[PDB]
Structures are given as structure tokens and as C-alpha cells.
């Protein structure tokens, strides 16, 4: 009844999905074989799993996911991991030659051999769902099919399915670091076309998570698994009101009504507040007015945009665990008193709260600790203007000598498509000043 069909694109999308689907099997009682034990039960309820899982006759729950990729090297550890048998075979769609860090090569040349096949497997999943709430795409702007084919999912997904919700959790490229060097061409050409085709977008960049895992968690030298464990705790807590009964529960459609002012500004920030380790967890108490302050703390934000440079257009808090609604409402009023946390003047209400009962689930081999409470947050600042006039610098720098253009033009492209896509970036930068500025 409350179905959502995850779809994961590219190597980052697959490796996010593993830490996100080990998380759900711990959260309900499903083991890696596929079926709940029936010796001992930890799933007290009846159809808590039915948002994500799907049941055959006998005993077995197979998820509604398609782990699509263009290179076989990453998807074949999914075919031999511990969860080798959780997944139905005909879902993990794989190409033969990868897109070679080109948006263009994964858009027009290589992506078109697999645009047909996933739009069959999406159908067999979606016709099973009576009440499909909305999909979820997980990508990263750097790569060649996390930018290229993920662009060409939603142009076909919009004309096929119409007005279904299609979230993205993405990776924006970081300001100073990034692995690639063709990467600011990819990220200017996909934010143009993951604009008119999508409903919400929760950017998080990798450089800020490294800053979190150094200070908040005490991990010297993190790797790409300790980053994926935290991204699962943000996906789960968004959809925790779909699967567990709450006091004030929030579905997917109540996000879009309440933090999206206009049909172009759909880039919330993100924070998960008590990221602590087990030597620093059990000593301190984690009261709701103690963990609400750390969502607004500018170092603990998850994108390298500083909220002290602009005006909050919304805020959307999500609480879990041992929370009472009288202490949610007490700590919100503290935030509005101090003059250094700037709210825009045509938003005098400012908040959208959600109370759930089930505390977050600790994962074996993970890094965090078992806590009674947590909180997420999705603000919408005008401080995201500052991480877009940086990408306009690094796109102009290369394009004014026309470096690297001979690869993208050389497969199925025009030259003006880099210049019709820069203008939308130059269009968006003046929206975030005219929406933000005060009215006289």
C-alpha cells in the first residue's frame, strides 16, 4: 500500500545501496538468505516491510530495487557477497563497456542500449505496487553514468509515469577536492536536466562527511564504507514514518509541500545530529534540546555551504525514539530568539516536525552507537548560492580555452549544449537572491 521502488545508478549508487540494504535487513528481521528465521522473531509487526520488500507465496522477501550499472566489476561483488541470494537475478542490470567518465558517452552512445531494459524491469516492479508512493534515485554527479544515464532515466520516467514522486539523493562534487578532472563539465550539464524532471534533491558532498568523521566520530582515515553507513541513516529516517507508527508522521508528499517554495528551488541541505562513537555516547545524555542545536550548527552541516551567509526559507526536522512533543516544541522556540540564525521574512511559521517511535538501528561492523533518540533536518537556505558560483568559476575556466570539449562533441552532441546549460546555472543564481532578499 505504501510502496517505494529504489533505483540505484552507477558504482557509487550500487555501493550506497549495499550499506542501505544491509540497513533495512537489520531493521526488520530479514536475514541475508531472504527469509525471516521463524526460530526466533525480532519482527514483531506484520507488514512493516511492505514499503520496500515483496513476498512470494512460501517464505521469501525480495526487495524492489534495480542496481543498474555500466561496468560489471562492481555489480559482480553483489552477485557473490553475503547478500548473493537476497536479490532476484533479473534486477541487477549490467552493461559491457562503461561510459568512461563522460556524461555524453553515457547519454547518447552507451546509455541507449540499456534505456530499454530497465524500463521493462521498472514496469514489472511498479505494476506489483498497488499504491506506489514514489521511487528513489541514488546517484553522484561526478561519473559518466551517475550523470549521463541518470539524466536519461527521468526524461523517460516523466513521460511514462507522469506525476509520481522521484527523489534524488545525490553527491555534489566537492569544492577543493574531487577525483576527476572532467567533472565540472558533467555537473553543469546534469543539474540542468535533473532540474525540470525531479521533485526533491538532497545534496551531500564527500568532503564534508570526511570533516564529520574526523571530529564528531573519532575516525582518523575514513574510507568509502564509513561514508555509506551515514548516508543510510539519512535515507532510513526520511522513510521511517512510512513503516513505523508515529505520533506525528510525515509521508513523502508532505515534504514537497512544505520545504519547496518554487518549482526550481528543490535542493535541501542535510544533517543527522548525534553522530557519536560508543566511548562518547553513553556518558552524555542526548535530550531533545541538546540534539536540536546540533542540526543548526554550521560545522556539522553536510554540504560545504555555510548557513551564516543567507536566510532560511524552511526547515524540516524528523525525530525518532524517546521523544515527547512537548520538548520538540520547547527547543524550536529557542532557535527563533537569537538574531544570528536568519529566517526569511515571508516565512513566519518556519518548521515542519515529525515524531516517530522506533529508535534507529545499529549495524554490526558499523561505526556509530545505539542511542535512544536522533534527529534529521532538511533546511533550505539561500546559502546554497555560494556552492554554485564556484562551479560557474571552474566551468568557465576550462571552457574559455575549450579544453576537453573534443570528447563530448565527438559523440552525439552539439557545441551550444555547454552554453545553454551554463545559462540555467546563471539563471538559478539570480533566483536565489531575489527569493531571498527582503521586500520593500
Amino acid at each position: 500500500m505504501r510502496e517505494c521502488i529504489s533505483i540505484h545508478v552507477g558504482q557509487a549508487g550500487v555501493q550506497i545501496g549495499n550499506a542501505c540494504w544491509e540497513l533495512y535487513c537489520l531493521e526488520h528481521g530479514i536475514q541475508p538468505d531472504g527469509q525471516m528465521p521463524s526460530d526466533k522473531t525480532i519482527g514483531g509487526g506484520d507488514d512493516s516491510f511492505n514499503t520496500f520488500f515483496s513476498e512470494t507465496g512460501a517464505g521469501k522477501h525480495v526487495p524492489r530495487a534495480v542496481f543498474v550499472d555500466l561496468e560489471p566489476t562492481v555489480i559482480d561483488e553483489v552477485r557473490t557477497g553475503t547478500y548473493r541470494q537476497l536479490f532476484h537475478p533479473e534486477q541487477l542490470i549490467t552493461g559491457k563497456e562503461d561510459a568512461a567518465n563522460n556524461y555524453a558517452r553515457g547519454h547518447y552512445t552507451i546509455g541507449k542500449e540499456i534505456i530499454d531494459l530497465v524500463l521493462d524491469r521498472i514496469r514489472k516492479l511498479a505494476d506489483q505496487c498497488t499504491g506506489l508512493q514514489g521511487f528513489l534515485v541514488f546517484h553522484s554527479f561526478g561519473g559518466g553514468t551517475g550523470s549521463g544515464f541518470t539524466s536519461l532515466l527521468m526524461e523517460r520516467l516523466s513521460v511514462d509515469y507522469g506525476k509520481k514522486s522521484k527523489l534524488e539523493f545525490s553527491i555534489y562534487p566537492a569544492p577543493q577536492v574531487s577525483t576527476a578532472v572532467v567533472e565540472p563539465y558533467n555537473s553543469i550539464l546534469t543539474t540542468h536536466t535533473t532540474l525540470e524532471h525531479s521533485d526533491c534533491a538532497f545534496m551531500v558532498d564527500n568532503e564534508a562527511i570526511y570533516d564529520i568523521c574526523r571530529r564528531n566520530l573519532d575516525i582518523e582515515r575514513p574510507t568509502y564504507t564509513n561514508l555509506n553507513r551515514l548516508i543510510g541513516q539519512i535515507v532510513s529516517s526520511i522513510t521511517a514514518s512510512l513503516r513505523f507508527d508515529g505520533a506525528l508522521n510525515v509521508d513523502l508528499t508532505e515534504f514537497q509541500t512544505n520545504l519547496v517554495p518554487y518549482p526550481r528551488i528543490h535542493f535541501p541541505l542535510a544533517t543527522y545530529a548525534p553522530v557519536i562513537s560508543a566511548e562518547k555516547a553513553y556518558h552524555e545524555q542526548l535530550s531533545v534540546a541538546e540534539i536540536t542545536n546540533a542540526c543548526f550548527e554550521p560545522a556539522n552541516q553536510m554540504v560545504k555551504c555555510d548557513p551564516r551567509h543567507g536566510k532560511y526559507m524552511a526547515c524540516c526536522l524528523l525525530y525518532r525514539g524517546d521523544v515527547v512533543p512537548k520538548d520538540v516544541n520547547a527547543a524550536i522556540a529557542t532557535i527563533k530568539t537569537k538574531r544570528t540564525i536568519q529566517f526569511v521574512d515571508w516565512c513566519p511559521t518556519g518548521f515542519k516536525v515529525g515524531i516517530n517511535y522506533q529508535p534507529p538501528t545499529v549495524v554490526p561492523g558499523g561505526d556509530l552507537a545505539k542511542v535512544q533518540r536522533a534527529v534529521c533536518m532538511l533546511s533550505n537556505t539561500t546559502a546554497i548560492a555560494e556552492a554554485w558560483a564556484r562551479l560557474d568559476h571552474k566551468f568557465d575556466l576550462m571552457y574559455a580555452k575549450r579544453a576537453f570539449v573534443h570528447w563530448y562533441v565527438g559523440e552525439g552532441m552539439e557545441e551550444g549544449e555547454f552554453s545553454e546549460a551554463r545559462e540555467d546555472m546563471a539563471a538559478l543564481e539570480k533566483d536565489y537572491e531575489e527569493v531571498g532578499v527582503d521586500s520593500v
Binding site: K401, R402, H406, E415
Partner: protein, 219 residues
């Protein structure tokens, strides 16, 4: 200072020294040509009229029946001279050589390529003004020279690629040197476009190969 990828310049406070310099945009030393040697010998059937209308080469023979197989690639070797007589004898004569003639400029343009490159390989800003006015004039005046220069875009377009962006930023103030075609990055756009007009297919592909910022015409 410091040199580069060393244990030095990994310091908390140390300045580096970059690459020294490169040999582009800077004027190349010249060489003794072959126009000088054949002039002081005295083979050339040319003489100079100091008219008061201007300076113009007299001709002691016809021009419609000269030995263009021997005299065309030798005036192109006089294109690397900057003194008084020789910068005039080469330039003024080449136009009169190019203006007259049919069915003999075609089999000799294979043989002119190496003095074209060797004058452009000099980075002197005044011969580049003069060698680029004739390249427009070479293409126009004959018939079917446009189709026979397309494999010979690979060797003469490198040097026009560096200097295409040479132009004047005079924000409102008018430019008084517009009489003489003295800016080269407007002369280059006059020439590369005039190469595309004549040649049919594959005239576009070869310049966009060679000047990579090119942006087609005739749409």
C-alpha cells in the same frame, strides 16, 4: 626559492619557481634567404619605378608567360625580408604574378608550401600582416585552388591557431588603424572563413581539426 617536486616546497612556508619560458609569441631570428642571392646575381626580369603615384615594379617582359615554376617559389622565399627593397620586391611582385595566369597556378601550389610555413614560423608581427593578405589573395584569384589546398591545411594552420585571438580592447575609443589591415586576429578570421567558402566537403572538418576553437559558417 625552491625548484619543484622536492622535499623542499613541501614546507609550510616556501615559494616555488615555475617553468622558465616557452618559445611562442616571441620573434624568431632570421636566416639568409634565396631571393637575395638570385637578385644580386641578376637573373630577375624586374625593375622599380619610383612613380609619384606610388612604387610599382616595372616589367621588362610579359607576365602572362613567365616561368612560374621557377619564380613563384622564389618570391615566396623573399617574404622573410624587412629592409627597404626586398620587402617591396617580393610583396608587390607576388600580387602581379598571382593576378595574371590561368591553368598554371594549379600544379605549382604543391611547391609553395615550405616558404609559406617558413615565413609564418617567423614570429614577426609585420610579415604576418603581409603574408596573411596574400593568403586571402591566393585563394580568390585563380580557379580550383580551393579544392587543392585542403590536405595542405594540416601544415599551415598550426601557426594561425596561436594568433587568432589577437585583438584590441578599446572599450569605447575608436580605432584609427582600421584603414590598414593591421590587426591579425581580425585578419585570421577573414582568412579561415575565406578558406571554407572554397573547397566543398571536408573544408570545415580540417580547420576545426586544426584551429580547435572554430565555429562554422554557411549554415
Amino acid at each position: 626559492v625552491s625548484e619543484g617536486f622536492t622535499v623542499k616546497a613541501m614546507m609550510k612556508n616556501s615559494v616555488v619557481r615555475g617553468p622558465p619560458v616557452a618559445g611562442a609569441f616571441k620573434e624568431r631570428p632570421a636566416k639568409p634567404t634565396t631571393f637575395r642571392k638570385c637578385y644580386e646575381r641578376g637573373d630577375f626580369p624586374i625593375a622599380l619605378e619610383h612613380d609619384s603615384k606610388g612604387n610599382k615594379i616595372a616589367w621588362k617582359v610579359e607576365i602572362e608567360k613567365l616561368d612560374y615554376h621557377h619564380y613563384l617559389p622564389l618570391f615566396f622565399d623573399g617574404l622573410s625580408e624587412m629592409t627597404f627593397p626586398y620587402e617591396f620586391f617580393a610583396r608587390r611582385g607576388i600580387h602581379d604574378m598571382l593576378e595574371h595566369g590561368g591553368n598554371k597556378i594549379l600544379p605549382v601550389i604543391p611547391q609553395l608550401i615550405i616558404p609559406i610555413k617558413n615565413a609564418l614560423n617567423l614570429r614577426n608581427r609585420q610579415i604576418i600582416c603581409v603574408t596573411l593578405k596574400v593568403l586571402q589573395h591566393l585563394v580568390v584569384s585563380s580557379e580550383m585552388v580551393g579544392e587543392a589546398l585542403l590536405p595542405y591545411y594540416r601544415q599551415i594552420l598550426p601557426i594561425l591557431n596561436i594568433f587568432k585571438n589577437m585583438n584590441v580592447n578599446s572599450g569605447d575609443g575608436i580605432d584609427y588603424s582600421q584603414q590598414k589591415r593591421e590587426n591579425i586576429g581580425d585578419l585570421i578570421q577573414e582568412t579561415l572563413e575565406a578558406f571554407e567558402r572554397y573547397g566543398g566537403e571536408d573544408a570545415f572538418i580540417n580547420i576545426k581539426y586544426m584551429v580547435p576553437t572554430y565555429e562554422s559558417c554557411l549554415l
